[PDB]
């Protein structure tokens, strides 16, 4: 089997990128963000606290005649940005694309963060890392991806992601009209739970290329490019007025400005960042201050390649037995 589903930005600044999934029979279509850098499928519901819903669709399990409540099974993540959401589980019918899944363990909310709740245009996750980082408990669960593997075509999925425009997810096969050149893998380590790889190095703009090993994630679900403070200091000294702002949380820069491409790389291939896709428009509503769209990772931990990165590249999630992931230019 194969499934094929178009993703869409939602706003103008690429903040994240929502995909319909059908939930429950009959299908009741939720538009939820699919996120590589976590492994728990969850969804606003008939359970979740009123006051914490505001504008978004919402799955009634009471209503699907193929839901069944997971006894005992309680849920409760907490993401790199400081939002969280709980829960209990039903297990349902889910559908991306065309590709179905019976028996998969849906998420249902009951409680949600402010930023969840604020975010109207999104319904809740789907999660694509590896399914040992699932928050289900006692038991824990296996997300989309891992149940329907199996029966794929080929064990995989690609993330092709628009610059101010949609893309698509495509899972069990590689569509070889959707990139140029060649796809260049690369070494995957599950041991943290992420699609954990290393790039080879990076070039600002026309600059040579800076040979050094920069290992990080591969993640869907984070706007933005975390990198080390050196490589970000470097970036952002090539753009006059540019600095970090410890009120404003980040790099920011004149919004009159025009950006430097960065350039990262896989293997012995590179992947260019064009400089518009790292403008994040104004800091507030009228400035003319803008703020950047990579930034320093020494706060968090670990490098994140977010959208800013992933948006620029044709990317292979390879699930096969040593998992690995590949990269195109598009």
């Known amino acids: 089997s194969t499934?094929?589903?178009?993703?869409?930005?939602?706003?103008?600044?690429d903040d994240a990128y929502i995909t319909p999934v059908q939930i429950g029979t009959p299908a009741q279509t939720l538009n939820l963000d699919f996120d590589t850098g976590s492994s728990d499928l969850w969804v606003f519901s008939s359970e979740t606290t009123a006051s914490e819903v505001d504008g978004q669709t919402i799955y009634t399990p009471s209503k699907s005649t193929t839901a069944k409540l997971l006894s005992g099974a309680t849920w409760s993540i907490s993401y790199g940005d400081?939002?969280?959401?709980?829960?209990?589980?039903?297990?349902?019918?889910?559908?991306?694309?065309?590709?179905?899944?019976?028996?998969?363990?849906?998420?249902?909310?009951?409680?949600?963060?402010?930023?969840?709740?604020e975010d109207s245009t999104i319904d809740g996750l789907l999660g694509l890392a590896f399914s040992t980082l699932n928050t289900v408990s006692p038991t824990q669960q296996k997300t989309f991806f891992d149940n329907a593997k199996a029966?794929?075509?080929?064990?995989?999925?690609?993330?092709?992601?628009?610059?101010?425009?949609?893309?698509?997810?495509?899972?069990?096969?590689?569509?070889?009209?959707?990139?140029?050149?060649?796809?260049?893998?690369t070494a995957v380590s599950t041991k943290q739970g992420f699609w954990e790889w290393t790039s080879?190095?990076?070039?600002?703009?026309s600059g040579t290329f800076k040979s050094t090993s920069?290992?990080?994630?591969?993640?869907?679900?984070?706007?933005?490019?975390?990198?080390?403070?050196?490589?970000?200091?470097?970036?952002?000294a090539q753009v006059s007025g540019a600095k970090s702002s410890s009120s404003v949380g980040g790099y920011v820069f004149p919004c009159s400005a025009t950006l430097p491409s960065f350039t990262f790389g896989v293997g012995s291939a590179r992947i260019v960042i064009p400089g518009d896709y790292i403008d994040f428009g104004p800091i507030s509503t009228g400035?003319?201050?803008?703020?950047?769209?990579?930034?320093?990772?020494?706060?968090?931990?670990?490098?994140?390649?977010?959208?800013?990165?992933?948006?620029?590249?044709?990317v292979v999630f390879n699930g096969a037995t040593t998992p690995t992931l590949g990269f195109a230019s598009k």
């Open 151 to 185: 029966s794929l075509d080929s064990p995989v999925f690609t993330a092709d992601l628009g610059y101010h425009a949609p893309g698509t997810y495509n899972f069990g096969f590689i569509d070889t009209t959707a990139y140029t050149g060649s796809i260049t893998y």
């Open 200 to 205: 080879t190095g990076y070039a600002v703009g």
């Open 3 to 13: 499934g094929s589903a178009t993703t869409t930005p939602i706003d103008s600044l």
């Open 214 to 236: 920069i290992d990080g994630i591969a993640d869907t679900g984070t706007t933005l490019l975390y990198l080390p403070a050196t490589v970000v200091s470097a970036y952002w």
């Open 287 to 314: 400035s003319s201050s803008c703020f950047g769209g990579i930034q320093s990772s020494a706060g968090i931990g670990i490098n994140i390649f977010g959208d800013v990165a992933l948006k620029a590249a044709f």
């Open 82 to 117: 400081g939002s969280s959401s709980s829960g209990d589980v039903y297990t349902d019918t889910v559908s991306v694309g065309g590709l179905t899944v019976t028996g998969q363990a849906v998420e249902s909310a009951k409680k949600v963060s402010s930023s969840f709740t």
